[PDB]
Design a protein around this nucleic acid. Structure first.
Lengths: 63, 64, 145, 56, 61, 206, 143, 141, 100
RNA sequence: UUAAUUGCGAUAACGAACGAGACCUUAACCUACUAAAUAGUGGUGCUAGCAUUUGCUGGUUAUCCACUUCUUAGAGGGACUAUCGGUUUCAAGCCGAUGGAAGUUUGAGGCAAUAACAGGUCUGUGAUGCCCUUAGACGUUCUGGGCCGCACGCGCGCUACACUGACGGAGCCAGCGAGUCUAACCUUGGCCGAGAGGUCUUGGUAAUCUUGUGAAACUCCGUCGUGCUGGGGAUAGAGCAUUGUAAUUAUUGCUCUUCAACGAGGAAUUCCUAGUAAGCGCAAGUCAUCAGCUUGCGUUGAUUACGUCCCUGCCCUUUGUACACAC
């Protein structure tokens, strides 16, 4: 079980056929020039904590 | 309660860091009724101390 | 402090009234297995016997079980009243009776034949295997045959 | 004699007795409505109609 | 569903065109002032109509 | 500890909770540490609750659910199975009962390690399914901060009563061993070997 | 000081009273104590069945205290409970009137209770004294 | 004219009449001490309005509370605020302002319901279901 | 003399008017008196199926109305009850005399 | 953008009407008014207890006095989305934090546009067009059965399938509503019987009496044990009572015995965004009697969103139509 971390700044919109999956812009603290979207199964909003397993591999709109 | 297990009970119950009715049943091959008398006898006898004797679960630990 | 170590008088199996009853359990709930004795009925015979209710079936001296047999044989002369017998006010003599495992099946079968020979409504329903209580078998009670 | 709740509803159905009976009998008389007033001893019933010369 | 209807909107703009210095930026002082110059025959209705005009004094500031 | 009594009999072992080192009514509350950065500001330990029985106005709004203490939220996730819907005082008694069961095995201040028992409970990543229709193509996503506190607290109880069906052991003695299990990453709890199967599709769907 | 039955625990009150009425059994012992279901809503007799008339006598003595007038219909309504009437759901039923009447007659035999004005039963002068006195000694038992 | 104030309190349907007066500081419910509340585990919770500010200033105030209506937790919720509301009333008659504000701040900082009544109230049930939003079980074919 | 008056009705305006008239006459002279005790109104509701048939979705309704009763008691000898015999009765409200 | 042609905006709209909205009721607050032994609070007198040394617990309408805080409704006040900061021609509108009883139209109901179904109804009328019967009448009345019935398939519901349990004890809290007169209701209390139940009386046309409906689910004590067992009461047998002119295919209740399936159930399907679901009980309805049903009421009281149009449907829209009592 490796370790990596980031966090969210602001929410944009939803994805998924049923509208449950949410992708939201995130940011990782050190070396603050780091910014990619990442989908989250649950609910997010501004100033939350992102958490994951791999380092950097984003996804996009779930059809 | 038999006799050959009486010696086992007295020499082995001050070795559980947690003692309870369910714990005695699982790891001693002792029924519920025989566990109730064992825990009430031990709490009255000495050593282990009744930190919380409550309804249906006598929460209990080891005292040395 | 109430603990008694085992001495050797405990027996696994018991043999009462031509029926098989298991031990290692409470005597108040031991006689309930035989046909014709329920939970409340077993409570009264045990209470009237004064045999230290909190006792296992296995640990029992042979001084008490046969007494339970004789008290339950004719309870009415022994102060258990008329409203504790299943066959209260019997249809043959009017006296009170309490059937046992060798009697609940014979008297019920005999009562079935009593109502059978008179061709009354309940007998033919019982003969057909149908409900005689007047319930609804349109949807309930279907997996019987 | 009778509970006020039962007295009032009995008044209401009695009130409904006049409404239909005045409507059914004095329909031609231009019947409009009935105002029922209760009073100790004597009581008065007020009727509304167009051809009042005929209702008398 | 806090969006107002037409009758409150049209009535609201009727006051300020001649009642600018009376529609004070406080709701409590003008929630009953409207009744004195606008004849409203409902306690419930007179509240939101006073509320809408009070809302515009906030933005018109 | 200002030992003053009033004209009603008050046993002074009750006035020691907050006019002292303000610890939970019978357990030390100050040494409570989070072992994961994922669930900061989402477990509402600090402030304390005397009994997790605040029937407050906490669930009407979207994100005011997590502002009650995790102890309070931990109560809620236990009354279900229909038979025990509602009847929350049935739970608050047992959680107050079982919290001393951690404070003996290398005491560790149970509330300190209650949070340590959430680091591996919540799924590290679950795989939401694309619309599709068929083989159910599930592409793996990371999870929200909330769903490692909000449904992970449902993962301590999603089937935790399957070890309480027609068996001798009571409810309160179970979570004690599973508590450190989520703290050490064990191989015999529920919430931490069903985190692993919840992400058996760990690094394949990217 | 100012101790009373109101200031003693309900479980403490019965256990202390259970000892007193079992250590002294002058009052009486009915003939059918061992065959009572205590209500039609019950299913099995109490498993104690050795005393169990002192436990009931203590509770009604407590019930008589902070209440003013209690008739036979008051106890059976309170002492009743739900019964599994077949597959039909639970329903509240009254308790046994005869046992309530017999225990009430027991309280009149000793003299702690008596017939009250406007019906019901009240607290006798001597009954109130003792109920307070035994309430005083049970507090220092745990002291 | 014995120093005395009166307050009240509701949680769901309980009306806890907090009769407050002056005395040696004896606190009881229905004439019974607070060592006997009901559930044996909310006993620490009903002590909350007393301990949050301490028993130091409770030695000269005594409150009578009589409660009726709702379930056991409902009355227990009624006593805590009624004696708390009665405490504010006593601070609203005799003791200085600076002391009063600190206790009131301590009451509300921990939780808001000690001085604010719960506005939640079961609304009437509706036809077409057992409750208001619950509905009968409907079937197709 | 314990003459007591009773006022029962459904609509509220008429019973309010007569009670104010009664208390105004009571206010005249001295007539040491008690104010109008307000009995708690009981809503008389009945649940009825709207449809006369059985076909259609389940639809119930509540048919209810309110009854307000207020009683006023007078305390002095027969001097007052020779002028209060005048009936200030409106449709709806009803009056009744009760003594002792 | 809003639950909403609900609003800003537009362009040839300028304006207006119904509905929604608006209106009313219920649940929320009023220590600001009116008051109340048919609701109460405190004190003063009489009476009992504890320790008595100070106080506490109670009872008392002809023992009075002061008040409406709690319980009542009467007129009213009160939230209107108010303040700031973010989004928007910076307009409607949305979001987060700052008073509170309340910032999902405060919550929910009542009323609830035009228009259609050849939707149900002739078993609701003494209003029914038409046909039929119309005197051994299909009209009325009287006796006995039927509407309950089983080789079978489905839908509403209740017990369930053990320990967050079963059983026996103690503490053990309300609301809606109902209740007799020339008829015989709500039944308090006393006595008898284990119980159902019976007898003698009491009060009530009702905030007063039933009723503080002292209800169950709830907690503290105990017995039990992982055992189709103490779970479970389907299956019957015998006896004891009530209702009714009459109860047999037991109305129903009570006592004893007999103690089967059920072991959390495979496609699909149902209701649900807060006191909501769910659990539990109560009152009312049908009643001479009988709730496993319905309506209302109260109690305990979760998890959890704060969104979407690929399904299940609808709304506006585009376009085609040899159709216009219109697939």
């Amino acid at each position: 079980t490796p370790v990596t971390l980031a966090k969210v700044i602001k929410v944009l919109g939803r994805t998924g056929s049923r509208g449950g999956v949410t992708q939201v812009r995130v940011e990782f603290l050190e070396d603050t020039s780091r910014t990619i979207v990442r989908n989250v199964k649950g609910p997010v909003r501004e100033n939350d904590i992102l958490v994951l397993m791999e380092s950097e591999r984003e996804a996009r709109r779930l059809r | 309660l038999d006799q050959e297990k009486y010696d086992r009970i007295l020499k082995e119950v001050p070795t559980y860091r947690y003692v309870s009715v369910s714990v005695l049943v699982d790891r001693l091959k002792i029924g519920g009724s025989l566990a109730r008398i064992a825990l009430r006898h031990l709490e009255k006898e000495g050593i282990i101390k009744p930190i919380s004797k409550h309804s249906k679960q006598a929460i209990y630990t080891r005292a040395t | 402090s109430l603990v008694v170590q085992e001495q050797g008088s405990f027996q696994h199996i018991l043999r009462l009234l031509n029926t098989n009853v298991d031990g290692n359990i409470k005597i108040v709930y031991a006689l309930t297995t035989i046909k014709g004795v329920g939970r409340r009925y077993s409570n009264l015979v045990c209470k009237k016997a004064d045999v230290d209710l909190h006792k296992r079936a296995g640990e029992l001296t042979q001084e008490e079980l046969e007494r339970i047999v004789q008290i339950m044989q004719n309870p009415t002369h022994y102060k258990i009243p008329a409203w504790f017998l299943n066959r209260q006010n019997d249809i043959t003599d009017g006296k009170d009776y309490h059937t046992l495992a060798n009697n609940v099946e014979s008297k019920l079968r005999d009562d079935l034949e009593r109502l059978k020979k008179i061709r009354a409504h309940r007998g033919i329903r019982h003969f057909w295997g149908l409900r005689v209580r007047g319930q609804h078998t349109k949807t309930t009670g279907r997996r019987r045959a | 004699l009778i509970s006020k709740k039962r007295k009032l509803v009995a008044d209401g159905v009695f009130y409904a007795e006049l409404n239909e009976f005045f409507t059914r009998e004095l329909a031609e008389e231009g019947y409009s409505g009935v105002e029922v007033r209760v009073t100790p001893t004597k009581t008065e019933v007020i009727i509304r109609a167009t051809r009042t010369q005929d209702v008398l | 569903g806090r969006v107002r209807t037409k009758t409150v909107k049209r009535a609201s703009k009727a006051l300020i065109e001649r009642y600018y210095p009376k529609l004070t930026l406080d709701f409590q002082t003008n929630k009953r002032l409207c009744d004195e110059i606008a004849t409203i025959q409902s306690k419930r209705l007179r509240n939101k109509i006073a509320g809408y005009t009070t809302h515009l004094m906030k933005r018109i500031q | 500890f200002t030992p003053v009594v009033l004209a009603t009999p008050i046993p002074e072992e009750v006035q020691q909770a907050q006019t002292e080192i303000k610890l939970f009514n019978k357990w030390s509350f100050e040494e409570v540490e989070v072992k994961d950065a994922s669930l900061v500001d989402y477990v509402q330990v600090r402030q304390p609750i005397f009994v997790a029985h605040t029937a407050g106005r906490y669930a009407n709004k979207r994100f005011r659910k997590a502002q009650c203490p995790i102890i309070e939220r931990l109560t809620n996730s236990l009354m279900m199975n229909g038979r025990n819907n509602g009847k929350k005082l049935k739970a608050v008694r047992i959680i107050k009962h079982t919290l001393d069961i951690i404070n003996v095995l290398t005491d560790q201040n149970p509330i300190q390690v209650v949070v340590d028992a959430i680091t591996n409970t919540g799924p590290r990543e679950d795989t939401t399914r694309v619309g599709g229709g068929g083989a159910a193509r599930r592409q793996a996503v990371d999870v929200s901060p909330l769903r490692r506190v909000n449904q992970a607290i449902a993962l301590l109880t999603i089937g935790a009563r399957e070890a309480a069906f027609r068996n001798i052991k009571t409810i309160a003695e179970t979570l004690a061993e599973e508590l450190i299990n989520a703290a050490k990453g064990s191989s015999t709890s529920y919430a931490i070997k069903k985190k692993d199967e919840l992400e058996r599709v760990a690094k394949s769907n990217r | 000081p100012g101790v009373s039955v109101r200031d003693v625990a309900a479980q403490d009150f019965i256990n202390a009273y259970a000892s007193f009425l079992q250590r002294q059994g002058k009052l009486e012992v009915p003939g059918y104590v061992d065959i009572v279901k205590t209500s039609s809503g019950n299913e099995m007799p109490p498993q104690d069945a050795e005393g169990w008339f002192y436990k009931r006598a203590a509770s009604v003595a407590r019930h008589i205290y902070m209440r003013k007038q209690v008739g036979v219909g008051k106890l059976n309504k309170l002492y009743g409970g739900a019964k599994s009437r077949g597959v039909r759901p639970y329903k509240h039923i009254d308790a046994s009137g005869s046992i309530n009447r017999k225990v009430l007659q027991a309280l009149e035999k000793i003299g702690i209770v008596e017939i009250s004005p406007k019906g019901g039963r009240r607290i006798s002068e001597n009954g109130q004294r003792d109920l307070d006195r035994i309430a005083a000694q049970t507090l220092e038992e745990d002291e | 004219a014995v120093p005395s104030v009166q307050t009240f309190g509701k949680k769901k349907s309980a009306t806890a009449v907090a009769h407050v007066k002056a005395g040696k500081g004896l606190i009881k419910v229905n004439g019974s001490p607070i060592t006997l509340v009901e559930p044996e585990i909310l006993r620490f919770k009903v002590y909350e309005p007393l301990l949050l500010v301490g028993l130091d200033k409770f030695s000269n105030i005594d409150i009578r509370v009589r409660v009726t209506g709702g379930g056991h937790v409902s009355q227990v919720y009624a006593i805590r605020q009624a004696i708390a509301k009665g405490l504010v009333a006593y601070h609203q008659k005799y003791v200085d302002e600076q002391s009063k504000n600190e206790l009131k701040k301590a009451f509300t900082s921990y939780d808001r319901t000690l001085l604010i009544a719960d506005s939640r109230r079961p609304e009437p049930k509706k036809f077409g279901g057992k409750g208001a939003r619950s509905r009968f079980q409907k079937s197709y074919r | 003399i314990k003459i007591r008056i009773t006022l029962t009705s459904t609509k509220v305006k008429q019973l309010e008017n007569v009670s104010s008239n009664i208390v105004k006459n009571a206010e005249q002279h001295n007539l040491v008196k008690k104010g109008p005790v307000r009995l708690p109104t009981k809503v008389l509701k009945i649940s009825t199926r709207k449809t006369p048939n059985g076909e259609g979705s389940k639809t119930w309704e509540t048919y209810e109305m309110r009854i307000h009763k207020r009683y006023i008691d007078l305390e002095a000898p027969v001097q007052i009850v020779k002028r209060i015999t005048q009936i200030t009765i409106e449709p709806g409200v009803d009056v009744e005399v009760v003594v002792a």
